[PDB]
């Protein structure tokens, strides 16, 4: 088990330079293999960016070479990525990946999304979608969170700290006319559980440092 974990500011302004680090745990970046950066534009497909070898040797994809560098801290078990003079084309999800000689990628990080705009971060407001039924109905009721007026992507929504998983649908964010994002998260429950159990949405927007719990009740 290796573990790749990328961090970096998720919003960087255009013409500025994007910096990302991959913390690697459970294996040594100087032990072997190659350490790669790959990005995926939203809606698009994977573009391979460059890499650094266990030796410290690096190489890159052209169409990026003249604006991109990659370095490492062996003392910290991390390699890094610098992409200068950034434009909207660079709005993507960035992945850490450890490549074998195959040369295939068995291990990847979760991906971190960087979006490139001059616009400011906006923490969201959270409103409840009251359950469709009472606890004496005896069928299924639906209740949700509505996360509204935030920038940038992404926001994360779980129910009851993550104990509640089944029947949960989180809709992709929809870019509003004000250029602010917005989504809803809904859950369907047996109606009888409305009088026996409390549903909380946990809404999480790192870029504004916002963590909100909303108790959804009638």
């Amino acid at each position: 088990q290796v573990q790749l974990q990328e961090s970096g500011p998720g919003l960087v302004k255009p013409s500025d330079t994007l910096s990302l680090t991959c913390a690697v745990s459970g294996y040594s970046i100087t032990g072997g293999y190659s350490w790669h950066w790959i990005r995926q534009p939203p809606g698009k497909g994977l573009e391979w960016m460059g890499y650094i070898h266990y030796s410290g040797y690096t190489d890159f994809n052209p169409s990026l070479k003249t604006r991109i560098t990659i370095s490492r801290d062996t003392s910290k078990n991390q390699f890094s990525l610098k992409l200068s003079s950034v434009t909207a084309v660079d709005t993507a999800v960035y992945y850490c990946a450890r490549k074998d000689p195959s040369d295939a990628f068995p291990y990847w990080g979760q991906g971190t999304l960087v979006t490139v705009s001059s616009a400011s971060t906006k923490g969201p407001s959270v409103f409840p979608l009251a359950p469709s039924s009472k606890s004496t109905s005896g069928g299924t009721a639906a209740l949700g969170c509505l996360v509204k007026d935030y920038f940038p992507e992404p926001v994360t929504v779980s129910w009851n700290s993550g104990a509640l998983t089944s029947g949960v649908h989180t809709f992709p964010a929809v870019l509003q006319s004000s250029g602010l994002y917005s989504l809803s998260s809904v859950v369907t429950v047996p109606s009888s559980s409305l009088g026996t159990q409390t549903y909380i949405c946990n809404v999480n927007h790192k870029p504004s440092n916002t963590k909100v719990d909303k108790r959804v009740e009638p």
């Binding site: 391979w48 195959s102 949700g144 809709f171 929809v174 809904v186 369907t188």
Partner: protein, 211 residues
């Protein structure tokens, strides 16, 4: 720059059926082609190596074959599990390259939307705007139409939809339509209706509320 071209680009497969996917390289990479699966919001998952070798911890379901310029991946028995998009990758020379992907959708039986309507909360309301949302839960196919009615006046250009990804267990879609109005505009009216038109629904459904 070896360029890779996959086929098809989108594909609709009935459950428990075979999915074939093909790559066409621009020169002979022989052995050196891998296949990844990517469900949405997740990192890709290696499926096939070299280009017919199986990964450990990967269903016997999946398999690959091909050489030089043409390669084929096959899922022998489509499972809901397999609602992803498939990539091939070339390992013959740098730069490293992936195909455009192949979205595979699972064509399950028709399901009918479960419709729900939600008044805007009084916290949001007290803040000037009112959002009324209509949840169409668990349906197939993806296609459906949602008509807002306010006091029977047909609303246009003030709504917005979002549609979820294909469920990985029952393979159905959910939809959300959001009507946004001014708080002033909100109580100039009494009835609010989400009218739903869909294939699995013999006649259109309307869900509403008052006050």
């Amino acid at each position: 720059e070896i360029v890779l071209t996959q086929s098809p680009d989108f594909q609709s497969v009935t459950p428990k059926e075979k999915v074939t996917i093909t790559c066409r390289a621009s020169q002979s990479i022989s052995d050196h082609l891998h296949w990844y699966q990517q469900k949405p919001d997740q990192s890709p998952k290696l499926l096939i190596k070299y280009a017919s070798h199986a990964i450990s911890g990967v269903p016997s379901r999946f398999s690959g074959s091909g050489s030089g310029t043409d390669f084929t991946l096959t899922i022998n028995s489509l499972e809901a599990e397999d609602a992803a998009t498939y990539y091939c990758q070339q390992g013959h020379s740098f730069p490293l390259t992936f195909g455009g992907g192949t979205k595979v959708e699972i064509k399950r039986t028709v399901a009918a939307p479960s419709v729900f309507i939600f008044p805007p909360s009084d916290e949001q309301l007290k803040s000037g705007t009112a959002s009324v949302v209509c949840l169409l839960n668990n349906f197939y196919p993806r296609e459906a139409k949602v008509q807002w009615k306010v006091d029977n006046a047909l609303q246009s250009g003030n709504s917005q939809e979002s549609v979820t990804e294909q469920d990985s267990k029952d393979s159905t879609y959910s939809l959300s339509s959001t009507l946004t109005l001014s708080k002033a505009d909100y109580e100039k009216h009494k009835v609010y209706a989400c009218e739903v038109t869909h294939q699995g629904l013999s006649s259109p459904v309307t869900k509403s509320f008052n006050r």
